[PDB]
Amino acid sequence: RKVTVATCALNQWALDFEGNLQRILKSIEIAKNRGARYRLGPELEICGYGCWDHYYESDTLLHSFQVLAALLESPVTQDIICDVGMPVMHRNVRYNCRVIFLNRKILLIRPKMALANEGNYRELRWFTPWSRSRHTEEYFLPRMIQDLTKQETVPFGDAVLVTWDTCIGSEICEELWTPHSPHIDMGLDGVEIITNASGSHHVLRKANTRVDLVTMVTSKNGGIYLLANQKGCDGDRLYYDGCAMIAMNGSVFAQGSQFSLDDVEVLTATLDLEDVRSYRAEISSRNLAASRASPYPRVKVDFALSCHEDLLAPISEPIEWKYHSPEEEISLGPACWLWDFLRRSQQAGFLLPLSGGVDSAATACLIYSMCCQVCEAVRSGNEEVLADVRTIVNQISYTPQDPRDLCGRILTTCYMASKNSSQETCTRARELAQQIGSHHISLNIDPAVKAVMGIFSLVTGKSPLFAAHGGSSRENLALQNVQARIRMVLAYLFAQLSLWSRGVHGGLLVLGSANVDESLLGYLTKYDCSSADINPIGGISKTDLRAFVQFCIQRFQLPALQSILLAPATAELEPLADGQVSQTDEEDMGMTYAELSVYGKLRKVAKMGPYSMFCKLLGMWRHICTPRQVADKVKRFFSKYSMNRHKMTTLTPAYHAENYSPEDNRFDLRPFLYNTSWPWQFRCIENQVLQLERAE
Amino acid sequence: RKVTVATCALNQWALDFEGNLQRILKSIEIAKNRGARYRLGPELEICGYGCWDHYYESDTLLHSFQVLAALLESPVTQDIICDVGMPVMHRNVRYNCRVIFLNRKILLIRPKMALANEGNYRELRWFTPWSRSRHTEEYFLPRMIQDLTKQETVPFGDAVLVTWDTCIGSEICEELWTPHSPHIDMGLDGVEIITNASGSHHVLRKANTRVDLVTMVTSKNGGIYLLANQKGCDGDRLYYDGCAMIAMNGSVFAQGSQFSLDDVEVLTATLDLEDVRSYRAEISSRNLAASRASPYPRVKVDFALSCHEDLLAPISEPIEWKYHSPEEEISLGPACWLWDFLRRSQQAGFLLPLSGGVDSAATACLIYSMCCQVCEAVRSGNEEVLADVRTIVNQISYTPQDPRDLCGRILTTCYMASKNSSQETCTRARELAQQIGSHHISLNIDPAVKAVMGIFSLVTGKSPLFAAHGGSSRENLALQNVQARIRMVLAYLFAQLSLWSRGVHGGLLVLGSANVDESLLGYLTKYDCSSADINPIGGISKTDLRAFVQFCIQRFQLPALQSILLAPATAELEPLADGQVSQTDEEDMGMTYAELSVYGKLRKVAKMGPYSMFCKLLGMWRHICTPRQVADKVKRFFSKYSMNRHKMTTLTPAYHAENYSPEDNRFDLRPFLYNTSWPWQFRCIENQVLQLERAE
Ligand SMILES: Nc1ncnc2c1ncn2[C@@H]1O[C@H](COP(=O)(O)OP(=O)(O)OC[C@H]2O[C@@H]([n+]3cccc(C(=O)O)c3)[C@H](O)[C@@H]2O)[C@@H](O)[C@H]1O
Ligand SMILES: Nc1ncnc2c1ncn2[C@@H]1O[C@H](COP(=O)(O)OP(=O)(O)OC[C@H]2O[C@@H]([n+]3cccc(C(=O)O)c3)[C@H](O)[C@@H]2O)[C@@H](O)[C@H]1O
Ligand SMILES: Nc1ncnc2c1ncn2[C@@H]1O[C@H](COP(=O)(O)O)[C@@H](O)[C@H]1O
Ligand SMILES: Nc1ncnc2c1ncn2[C@@H]1O[C@H](COP(=O)(O)O)[C@@H](O)[C@H]1O
Ligand SMILES: [Cl-]
Ligand SMILES: [Cl-]
Ligand SMILES: [Cl-]
Ligand SMILES: [Cl-]
Ligand SMILES: [Cl-]
Ligand SMILES: [Cl-]
Ligand SMILES: [Cl-]
Ligand SMILES: [Cl-]
Ligand SMILES: [Cl-]
Ligand SMILES: [Cl-]
Ligand SMILES: [Mg+2]
Ligand SMILES: [Mg+2]
C-alpha cells in the first residue's frame, strides 16, 4: 500500500570525493527524516558526472569505492534502500553504474545500456554499454567491500528489485528517450516504481521536454517515476539544472528546482501503490500482442518499502509544474553558475570590462542577480551559502542583506575609454555600476596606445593612420585592434592588482562578454576583451540578451538599462569624418543578428552545409529574396564563418545555453583551416541559381 | 520534396460490398481531384470492420477480392497509391490486412501484428497476428487477380515501401499503442511517412488520447503520420467516430470530423519531406544505442510521390485540434447513430415512449439533434442525405429546412398515463413534443390494466391490492409491473400501427430510455419499456443525461426542458396514501446516481470485486463513512447487482458511450446466475471491518 520515496538534486564536483560523500550522506539523512525508505541520487554522483578523461584513471574507480564503503558503514543509511552512481569495471570493462545497497549489503549493480554520444556528451569515450539484456553476471567485490559487507559477489546487470511489497526498476538518464526504453518492458513485467538517475545540463527552453516525457511515460504505462539530477557546476562550462521529479500515472507530485544555490535538495512523496495497480487495470488488465520475450531477472530483497506509517502519513496530492520564462531562465542559470565558479575557484571576485553596451550590461545583471540569489539564500537559512560568502569576503561576521552591498564587495567594473569614446557610453557605464553597487573604474587607454604606436614608428619609420585620416583599410583595422588588445592587457592588470590597490588580498576572475551570434561569425578581435577567464553569456543569443536586459529593468529596478538599450550599437574605436556617423555592428557584419541566428540554427541544429542551407532559405525567404540574393547571403555567411573559425579555438569558455553553440572544445568539433572559397559547394549553389533564373 | 497525401473516414457497412466499394472509389476520386498521390483508408474497409462471425465465412474473403478486382480495374485509381483493408488468408491462416496497389499492381499485402482483444474487440476470434517480424513470404494471388494484374505472387508481411523519393510504412490501428510499436523501428530505419488504418469506436471523452498519441509519436520520432478511421454505424451497437488526421513533426495539419452525416470525408495535406529530414537532424543526426536488429524489408516501387506540382502547391499550415464538449459529444454521436440506424433499417421512423422525465426527454433531444444535423447537411449540399430523407418520408420533392418539420414526419412520441399519473408529467410531455415537432400521442392505460387484473381475479378468485390500499409488498410490485408491461405492449402496437392509423405506409423503431446506471443495478422491470428495439442513451450516465438536457435548453431553444429538470424523479405507478409523498428513484435504489456511478467505474474500469472495492472506498470515503458503513454500501451494491443481472441478458441493445457499460452481449461478459450472498467475499469484508473496529 502506502510508500514514501525520495529523489534529489546534488551539486556534485568532479573528483571532489570528500564533498561528494557529504552531499550524498546529507540527502539520505534528509530523506530518512522525511520517512523515505528508498532514496534515488543522480548519475555518477559519487565521483561527479563531469570527470571526463579522469575516467581513464584507476584512482577514480578506487576512491569511488572508498566513498561507497564510507556510505555502507554509515549509521544514517540504515533501513533505507540507497541507489548511488559510480563507475565500475567488470571483467576489464568500464561501465557507468547504479549501486543499490541496503543495511550494509549491496543488492544489485546496474550498468547503463545506452550511452550519450551527442553534443557535450561523449560517454563512449570511457564507458561501454551493457549489451547482455535481461541478464546478470556475478560481480566480484573488492576485498575492501567484502570485509565490510560480508559478500563475495553481487548481481551485475539488467535486473529489477523485488521487495516484500513492490518491484523497483532502473532507467539511467538518456535510456528514458532511447528507442525501446527499459520502462516499456519493466511495465509489462509489473515494475511499479522506476528510478532514473540523470546528469543532464541546462539548455535554454528545453526544460519541459524532460517533464513531458516522464509525464507521458507514466500516463502511457502507469507507475511511479523518480528522476534525480545533478544541480550546479561540476567543474566546467556546463550547468546541470536538476529538475528532479516524482511522477505517477501521468501526474506530477514533486517538482525540484532548476536553479538554486542549494548543495542538496531532496524531494519526497507519499504514494499508495494500489493507485498504480488500479490505474493499470483501468488501461489493459488483459494480455498484450503475445511477445514471449526474455523476462527481467529478479533480485529478491528482504525489505518492506511500506512500513506501518499509513496511520498518519498523508498521501501526496498532484501538482502543476511551474516553468521559468526564458528571461527568468537567463537571469538564474548563468547566475548560479557564476556563484559556483566564484566559490570553487577560491577567487576574490570578478572583474568586468563594462562598455556601456548591451552585452557587458547583461553580464553585470547576471552578477547582480547572483547577489540577490545569495541574499535570498542567506535569508532562507542556507548555512552553506552564508559560510561561502563569509569565506569569499573574509569577514566572519558578515551577513549579506542588501544585494548592492554584496555586489560592491564582489564585482569590479571597468570602463576603458579610447580617444574616440563618447561621453554618453562612459556615463551609462558609470550609472549602471552606481545602480548595482559595483566598484567602478573609469580610465583612458590612449597614453598606452600612443606609446605602442610610438614603438612601432620608432622602429619602422612609418605612422599608421585611421581610415578617416586617409589611412588604408589595413591600417585602420590594426589601430582599432591595438586599442582592443590594450584593453585586455589592462583588464588583466586590474584583475591581478586592483584589490591590491585597494589594500586587500586576492585577485579577480576576468569576465568576458561575447555573445553566441558574434562568436559564430568570428566578428571579434583575437585576444581583445573577448578573451577572459569565463564568459557567462557566450552561449546566449543577442536577441535574448536584449530581451533579458529589458526584463531586468523592472525585476531589479535598474533604470540605467533603458538608455543602454536605446543607444546605437557602435564600437567607438575610430574617429568619425565630417558628414557621416558611426557604423553599427549589424552593418559591419553584413547581416542582422536575426538572420545571423537563423544561419546559426540551420547550421548546427538542422545540420545544414551551404548547399542545404541555400535550399532551405530559398523557400523560407521566397517572398523576401530572389535566388541570386539568398545565394549571396549564404555565401557571405559561410566565407566569413570559415575565415574566422580559428578565433574559436582560443575563445574563452562559455556557459552553455543554446544548442547551436559554435564552441570548439566540446560541443562543436570542426576544422579551423578551411578552403574559404568553398569552390565545389558554391558551384552547386550557382548551378541551382542559374537553373531557376531560367524561368518566365 | 513536396508531397500530397490523403486519408479518410468512411461510413462502411458490414458485408455491404456494393456500397463499400462505391465509398472507397469516391474517396480515391476525391483525393485525386485534390492532387493526392497516396490514399489511406480505414481498417478492413472493404468488408466493413464489424462483420463479426461472418469472418469465419469464406464468402467474405471471396467478395472482398471481387471488390479488390473492381478497384484494380478502375480508371480512377490510376497514378495514386491505394492502401485498402481486407481479410486475407495466407497458408490457411486468416490475417487482417492492408492491400497496397498502384496502377493495377499489388505492391504489398501487410498483415496486422497486434490484435485487439479487449472490451468490444475480439480480433483473435477470427484473425491471427503475423508473428514473423521483419520478414515477408510470397503470397499467391487468386486467378481472378492474376489475370487482371498479371502477377503470380506478391510480398506478404512486415515490409515498407520505397519509392523514388520516399519511404512509407504501415501501423494498423492498435499497433500505435502496443508496446514496441512499428513506428519506433520504422523511424530508426528512415521511414518518412507512416500510415495507420483504424476502426476505433466512439468513447465518451477519450477523443484526445488518439490525437495526443499521434502527436507525441510524430514529435518524438519525427515524420508524417496518417490516420484513417471508419465513421458511423456499421451494423451494430458501436459508433465509429473517425477522427482521421494528418500529423507531422508534432503538429496537426488536418482534422477529420468525429460525427457527421457524410458517407465519405477525405483529408489532404501538402507537406515538404525535407521538413521531416531536417526535423530529424534537429534531434539525433547521430547513431543510437547500438541496436543491430533485423532491418525492415523493402518493396521497391517505381513511382514518385512528389510530381512537379510544387510550382503552385501551397504547403499546409499547422492547425489546432478543436474538441467537442462532453455535452456536444452526446448531442452528436447517438444522434448520427440514430440516423444511420433509421436509414439502413429502411424503417419509416421512430416511436418514443415519452414520460415527462429526464431520460425519455434526452432521447427526444437526440432525435431533434438528428433532425438539425440532417437539415444542416441538406443545406450543405449533401446529396446522399437528401436522397435518404426523401426515401424515408417517401416524398421525392421534399427538402428539410425546418427541423421541427422533419421531426414531425419522423418521430412519434407517446405518453401513457396510469390511474396515478399526475397532470404535470402529462403536460410536460405534451409541451416538449409541441416544441420539437413530433406527432404526440397521449392515452390512458387503465382500461387495459383493469382488464388484465380482471382476468386474474376471474380465475384465482383473489384481488391484489396496492401497498397503500393494504396490499403486500409482492402485490404492490406485481401491480406496478403490469402497468409497466402494458405500456410496452401498447408501445409496440403503435410502433406497428400508428402510421397505419394516420393513413400511411410503414412501421416504427421502438426507442428505449434506460440509462447505464440503472441498467447496471437492474433497477428496471424485465420487459417493460426498458426493452425496445434500440436504446441510444443506454450507455450514458444519469449525471451526463441531466448535463446534456440542460445544455439542450439554449442550443435547441426548448424551454419545456426546465420543468422536466426541476420535477422530482418519481415513478407514478402506485397511489399515494395520506400524509406521504412519492418516493424518489434514488431512495428506491438505496444509493445516489453519483455513488452508483462510482461503483460502476470501480467495478468495470478499475476491475474491482467486492473486497477490492470495499478497500478502495474505505480510503476514498474515509472522512464521510465508517468501515462498517462502506461495507454495507458495497454489500448492498453487489447483492442488488447480482440479483438483477439476468435482466441484462435480454436488455435492448445500446449505443456504446461509457467504458463502464454492463452490456452483456459484447462489452461485459458475466455469469447471470450468481450466489447472491457472496459468502466468501463478504466474510473477507467483515473480517477487515472487525479488525478496524479494534482501534481506540
Ligand atoms: N586559417 C587560419 N588559421 C589560423 N590563423 C589564421 C587563419 N587565417 C587568418 N589567421 C590569423 O589570425 C589573426 C587574426 O587576428 P587579427 O589579425 O588581429 O585580426 P582579426 O581578429 O581577423 O580582425 C578583427 C575583426 O574584429 C572586428 N572588430 C573591429 C572593431 C571592434 C570590434 C568589436 O566588436 O570588439 C570588432 C573587425 O571588423 C575585424 O573584422 C591574423 O594574424 C591572421 O593572420
Ligand atoms: N438468477 C436468476 N436467473 C434468471 N431469472 C431470475 C433469477 N432471479 C430471479 N429471476 C426472475 O426474473 C424475473 C424478474 O422480473 P419481475 O418478476 O417482473 O420483477 P423485477 O423486474 O425483478 O422487479 C422490478 C423492479 O423494478 C423497480 N421499478 C418499479 C416501478 C417502476 C420502475 C421504473 O423505473 O420503471 C422500476 C421495482 O422497484 C422492482 O425492484 C422474475 O420472474 C424472477 O423470478
Ligand atoms: N569601452 C569599453 N570599456 C570596457 N570594455 C569594453 C569597451 N569596449 C569594448 N569592451 C569589451 O570589448 C568587447 C566588445 O568590443 P566592442 O564591440 O569593440 O565594444 C566586450 O568583451 C567588452 O567587454
Ligand atoms: N408515463 C410514461 N409514458 C411513457 N413512457 C413511460 C412512462 N413512464 C415510464 N415510461 C417508460 O418506462 C421507463 C421508465 O420507467 P418509470 O421509471 O417507471 O417511468 C422508460 O423506458 C420510459 O420511456
Ligand atoms: Cl581488491
Ligand atoms: Cl528470475
Ligand atoms: Cl595574495
Ligand atoms: Cl550594444
Ligand atoms: Cl545592441
Ligand atoms: Cl483461385
Ligand atoms: Cl531488403
Ligand atoms: Cl406496409
Ligand atoms: Cl427524472
Ligand atoms: Cl432525474
Ligand atoms: Mg551590447
Ligand atoms: Mg428521467
mmCIF file with all atom_site columns, C-alpha atoms in Angstrom, chain A residues 508-611:
data_model
loop_
_atom_site.group_PDB
_atom_site.id
_atom_site.type_symbol
_atom_site.label_atom_id
_atom_site.label_alt_id
_atom_site.label_comp_id
_atom_site.label_asym_id
_atom_site.label_entity_id
_atom_site.label_seq_id
_atom_site.pdbx_PDB_ins_code
_atom_site.Cartn_x
_atom_site.Cartn_y
_atom_site.Cartn_z
_atom_site.occupancy
_atom_site.B_iso_or_equiv
_atom_site.pdbx_formal_charge
_atom_site.auth_seq_id
_atom_site.auth_comp_id
_atom_site.auth_asym_id
_atom_site.auth_atom_id
_atom_site.pdbx_PDB_model_num
ATOM 1   C CA . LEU A 1 508 ? 39.739 38.566 -9.701  1.00 0.00 ? 508 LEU A CA 1
ATOM 2   C CA . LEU A 1 509 ? 38.268 36.344 -12.416 1.00 0.00 ? 509 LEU A CA 1
ATOM 3   C CA . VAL A 1 510 ? 38.105 38.322 -15.681 1.00 0.00 ? 510 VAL A CA 1
ATOM 4   C CA . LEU A 1 511 ? 34.613 38.041 -17.216 1.00 0.00 ? 511 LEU A CA 1
ATOM 5   C CA . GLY A 1 512 ? 34.046 38.147 -20.984 1.00 0.00 ? 512 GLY A CA 1
ATOM 6   C CA . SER A 1 513 ? 31.045 39.445 -22.942 1.00 0.00 ? 513 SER A CA 1
ATOM 7   C CA . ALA A 1 514 ? 30.931 37.751 -26.324 1.00 0.00 ? 514 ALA A CA 1
ATOM 8   C CA . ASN A 1 515 ? 27.505 36.539 -27.413 1.00 0.00 ? 515 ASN A CA 1
ATOM 9   C CA . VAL A 1 516 ? 26.868 33.275 -29.255 1.00 0.00 ? 516 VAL A CA 1
ATOM 10  C CA . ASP A 1 517 ? 25.963 35.078 -32.520 1.00 0.00 ? 517 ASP A CA 1
ATOM 11  C CA . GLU A 1 518 ? 29.254 37.053 -32.937 1.00 0.00 ? 518 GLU A CA 1
ATOM 12  C CA . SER A 1 519 ? 31.294 34.115 -31.647 1.00 0.00 ? 519 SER A CA 1
ATOM 13  C CA . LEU A 1 520 ? 29.967 32.149 -34.652 1.00 0.00 ? 520 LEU A CA 1
ATOM 14  C CA . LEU A 1 521 ? 30.751 34.777 -37.290 1.00 0.00 ? 521 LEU A CA 1
ATOM 15  C CA . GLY A 1 522 ? 34.109 35.441 -35.613 1.00 0.00 ? 522 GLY A CA 1
ATOM 16  C CA . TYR A 1 523 ? 33.191 39.113 -35.525 1.00 0.00 ? 523 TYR A CA 1
ATOM 17  C CA . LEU A 1 524 ? 35.635 39.779 -32.689 1.00 0.00 ? 524 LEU A CA 1
ATOM 18  C CA . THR A 1 525 ? 39.303 40.669 -32.227 1.00 0.00 ? 525 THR A CA 1
ATOM 19  C CA . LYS A 1 526 ? 41.517 37.709 -31.400 1.00 0.00 ? 526 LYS A CA 1
ATOM 20  C CA . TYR A 1 527 ? 42.791 38.293 -27.854 1.00 0.00 ? 527 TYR A CA 1
ATOM 21  C CA . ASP A 1 528 ? 40.827 41.505 -27.152 1.00 0.00 ? 528 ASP A CA 1
ATOM 22  C CA . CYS A 1 529 ? 38.407 41.575 -24.211 1.00 0.00 ? 529 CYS A CA 1
ATOM 23  C CA . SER A 1 530 ? 36.597 38.714 -25.931 1.00 0.00 ? 530 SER A CA 1
ATOM 24  C CA . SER A 1 531 ? 39.153 36.529 -24.240 1.00 0.00 ? 531 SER A CA 1
ATOM 25  C CA . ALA A 1 532 ? 38.771 36.477 -20.489 1.00 0.00 ? 532 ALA A CA 1
ATOM 26  C CA . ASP A 1 533 ? 38.645 33.662 -17.958 1.00 0.00 ? 533 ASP A CA 1
ATOM 27  C CA . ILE A 1 534 ? 34.946 32.759 -18.173 1.00 0.00 ? 534 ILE A CA 1
ATOM 28  C CA . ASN A 1 535 ? 32.072 34.015 -20.265 1.00 0.00 ? 535 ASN A CA 1
ATOM 29  C CA . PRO A 1 536 ? 28.544 33.565 -18.877 1.00 0.00 ? 536 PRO A CA 1
ATOM 30  C CA . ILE A 1 537 ? 26.711 34.974 -21.907 1.00 0.00 ? 537 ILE A CA 1
ATOM 31  C CA . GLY A 1 538 ? 28.898 33.297 -24.514 1.00 0.00 ? 538 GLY A CA 1
ATOM 32  C CA . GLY A 1 539 ? 26.101 30.934 -25.478 1.00 0.00 ? 539 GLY A CA 1
ATOM 33  C CA . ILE A 1 540 ? 23.152 33.295 -25.432 1.00 0.00 ? 540 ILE A CA 1
ATOM 34  C CA . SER A 1 541 ? 21.548 34.908 -28.470 1.00 0.00 ? 541 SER A CA 1
ATOM 35  C CA . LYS A 1 542 ? 21.793 38.680 -28.972 1.00 0.00 ? 542 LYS A CA 1
ATOM 36  C CA . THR A 1 543 ? 18.033 38.944 -29.181 1.00 0.00 ? 543 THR A CA 1
ATOM 37  C CA . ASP A 1 544 ? 17.698 37.038 -25.916 1.00 0.00 ? 544 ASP A CA 1
ATOM 38  C CA . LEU A 1 545 ? 20.287 39.351 -24.338 1.00 0.00 ? 545 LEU A CA 1
ATOM 39  C CA . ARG A 1 546 ? 18.218 42.417 -25.260 1.00 0.00 ? 546 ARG A CA 1
ATOM 40  C CA . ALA A 1 547 ? 15.119 40.582 -24.026 1.00 0.00 ? 547 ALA A CA 1
ATOM 41  C CA . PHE A 1 548 ? 16.869 39.725 -20.759 1.00 0.00 ? 548 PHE A CA 1
ATOM 42  C CA . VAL A 1 549 ? 18.105 43.266 -20.193 1.00 0.00 ? 549 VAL A CA 1
ATOM 43  C CA . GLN A 1 550 ? 14.655 44.770 -20.742 1.00 0.00 ? 550 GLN A CA 1
ATOM 44  C CA . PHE A 1 551 ? 13.277 42.318 -18.231 1.00 0.00 ? 551 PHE A CA 1
ATOM 45  C CA . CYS A 1 552 ? 15.924 43.386 -15.713 1.00 0.00 ? 552 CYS A CA 1
ATOM 46  C CA . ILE A 1 553 ? 14.644 46.953 -15.695 1.00 0.00 ? 553 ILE A CA 1
ATOM 47  C CA . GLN A 1 554 ? 11.524 46.118 -13.632 1.00 0.00 ? 554 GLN A CA 1
ATOM 48  C CA . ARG A 1 555 ? 12.685 42.940 -11.816 1.00 0.00 ? 555 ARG A CA 1
ATOM 49  C CA . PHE A 1 556 ? 15.875 44.534 -10.474 1.00 0.00 ? 556 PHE A CA 1
ATOM 50  C CA . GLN A 1 557 ? 14.856 48.204 -10.646 1.00 0.00 ? 557 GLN A CA 1
ATOM 51  C CA . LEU A 1 558 ? 17.751 49.380 -12.821 1.00 0.00 ? 558 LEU A CA 1
ATOM 52  C CA . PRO A 1 559 ? 16.704 52.419 -14.948 1.00 0.00 ? 559 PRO A CA 1
ATOM 53  C CA . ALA A 1 560 ? 20.252 52.828 -16.284 1.00 0.00 ? 560 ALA A CA 1
ATOM 54  C CA . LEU A 1 561 ? 19.459 49.957 -18.666 1.00 0.00 ? 561 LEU A CA 1
ATOM 55  C CA . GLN A 1 562 ? 16.941 51.941 -20.750 1.00 0.00 ? 562 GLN A CA 1
ATOM 56  C CA . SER A 1 563 ? 19.492 54.320 -22.236 1.00 0.00 ? 563 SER A CA 1
ATOM 57  C CA . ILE A 1 564 ? 21.812 51.357 -22.780 1.00 0.00 ? 564 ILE A CA 1
ATOM 58  C CA . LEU A 1 565 ? 19.072 49.617 -24.768 1.00 0.00 ? 565 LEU A CA 1
ATOM 59  C CA . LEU A 1 566 ? 18.159 52.763 -26.694 1.00 0.00 ? 566 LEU A CA 1
ATOM 60  C CA . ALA A 1 567 ? 21.750 53.632 -27.618 1.00 0.00 ? 567 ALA A CA 1
ATOM 61  C CA . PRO A 1 568 ? 23.083 52.764 -31.115 1.00 0.00 ? 568 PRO A CA 1
ATOM 62  C CA . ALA A 1 569 ? 25.216 49.590 -31.098 1.00 0.00 ? 569 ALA A CA 1
ATOM 63  C CA . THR A 1 570 ? 28.513 51.146 -32.250 1.00 0.00 ? 570 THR A CA 1
ATOM 64  C CA . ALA A 1 571 ? 32.190 50.467 -31.471 1.00 0.00 ? 571 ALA A CA 1
ATOM 65  C CA . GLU A 1 572 ? 33.869 53.851 -30.882 1.00 0.00 ? 572 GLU A CA 1
ATOM 66  C CA . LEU A 1 573 ? 37.424 52.881 -31.797 1.00 0.00 ? 573 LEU A CA 1
ATOM 67  C CA . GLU A 1 574 ? 37.935 55.059 -34.914 1.00 0.00 ? 574 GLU A CA 1
ATOM 68  C CA . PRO A 1 575 ? 37.449 58.805 -35.410 1.00 0.00 ? 575 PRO A CA 1
ATOM 69  C CA . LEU A 1 576 ? 34.426 59.880 -37.455 1.00 0.00 ? 576 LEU A CA 1
ATOM 70  C CA . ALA A 1 577 ? 34.907 62.053 -40.556 1.00 0.00 ? 577 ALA A CA 1
ATOM 71  C CA . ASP A 1 578 ? 32.649 65.024 -41.238 1.00 0.00 ? 578 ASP A CA 1
ATOM 72  C CA . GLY A 1 579 ? 29.309 64.209 -42.853 1.00 0.00 ? 579 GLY A CA 1
ATOM 73  C CA . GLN A 1 580 ? 28.979 60.659 -41.524 1.00 0.00 ? 580 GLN A CA 1
ATOM 74  C CA . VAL A 1 581 ? 28.005 58.869 -38.318 1.00 0.00 ? 581 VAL A CA 1
ATOM 75  C CA . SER A 1 582 ? 29.178 55.642 -36.670 1.00 0.00 ? 582 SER A CA 1
ATOM 76  C CA . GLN A 1 583 ? 28.607 52.330 -38.444 1.00 0.00 ? 583 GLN A CA 1
ATOM 77  C CA . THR A 1 584 ? 26.515 49.782 -36.498 1.00 0.00 ? 584 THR A CA 1
ATOM 78  C CA . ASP A 1 585 ? 27.791 46.286 -35.794 1.00 0.00 ? 585 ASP A CA 1
ATOM 79  C CA . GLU A 1 586 ? 24.941 44.827 -37.951 1.00 0.00 ? 586 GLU A CA 1
ATOM 80  C CA . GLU A 1 587 ? 26.143 46.833 -40.985 1.00 0.00 ? 587 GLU A CA 1
ATOM 81  C CA . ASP A 1 588 ? 29.719 45.928 -40.115 1.00 0.00 ? 588 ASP A CA 1
ATOM 82  C CA . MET A 1 589 ? 28.800 42.202 -40.166 1.00 0.00 ? 589 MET A CA 1
ATOM 83  C CA . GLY A 1 590 ? 26.731 42.493 -43.322 1.00 0.00 ? 590 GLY A CA 1
ATOM 84  C CA . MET A 1 591 ? 23.660 40.827 -41.786 1.00 0.00 ? 591 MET A CA 1
ATOM 85  C CA . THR A 1 592 ? 21.215 41.340 -38.900 1.00 0.00 ? 592 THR A CA 1
ATOM 86  C CA . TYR A 1 593 ? 21.532 39.390 -35.658 1.00 0.00 ? 593 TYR A CA 1
ATOM 87  C CA . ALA A 1 594 ? 18.089 37.994 -36.523 1.00 0.00 ? 594 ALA A CA 1
ATOM 88  C CA . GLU A 1 595 ? 19.248 36.467 -39.822 1.00 0.00 ? 595 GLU A CA 1
ATOM 89  C CA . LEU A 1 596 ? 22.560 35.551 -38.180 1.00 0.00 ? 596 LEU A CA 1
ATOM 90  C CA . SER A 1 597 ? 20.632 33.447 -35.634 1.00 0.00 ? 597 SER A CA 1
ATOM 91  C CA . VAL A 1 598 ? 18.846 31.657 -38.492 1.00 0.00 ? 598 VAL A CA 1
ATOM 92  C CA . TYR A 1 599 ? 22.158 30.673 -40.104 1.00 0.00 ? 599 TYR A CA 1
ATOM 93  C CA . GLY A 1 600 ? 23.357 29.564 -36.696 1.00 0.00 ? 600 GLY A CA 1
ATOM 94  C CA . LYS A 1 601 ? 20.401 27.278 -36.092 1.00 0.00 ? 601 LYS A CA 1
ATOM 95  C CA . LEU A 1 602 ? 20.166 25.992 -39.669 1.00 0.00 ? 602 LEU A CA 1
ATOM 96  C CA . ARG A 1 603 ? 23.845 25.141 -39.391 1.00 0.00 ? 603 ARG A CA 1
ATOM 97  C CA . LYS A 1 604 ? 24.186 23.401 -36.045 1.00 0.00 ? 604 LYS A CA 1
ATOM 98  C CA . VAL A 1 605 ? 20.656 22.381 -35.170 1.00 0.00 ? 605 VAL A CA 1
ATOM 99  C CA . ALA A 1 606 ? 19.394 21.381 -38.657 1.00 0.00 ? 606 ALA A CA 1
ATOM 100 C CA . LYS A 1 607 ? 22.872 20.183 -39.713 1.00 0.00 ? 607 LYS A CA 1
ATOM 101 C CA . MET A 1 608 ? 22.983 22.121 -42.997 1.00 0.00 ? 608 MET A CA 1
ATOM 102 C CA . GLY A 1 609 ? 26.091 22.889 -45.065 1.00 0.00 ? 609 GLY A CA 1
ATOM 103 C CA . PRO A 1 610 ? 25.987 25.743 -47.611 1.00 0.00 ? 610 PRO A CA 1
ATOM 104 C CA . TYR A 1 611 ? 24.025 23.908 -50.325 1.00 0.00 ? 611 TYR A CA 1
#
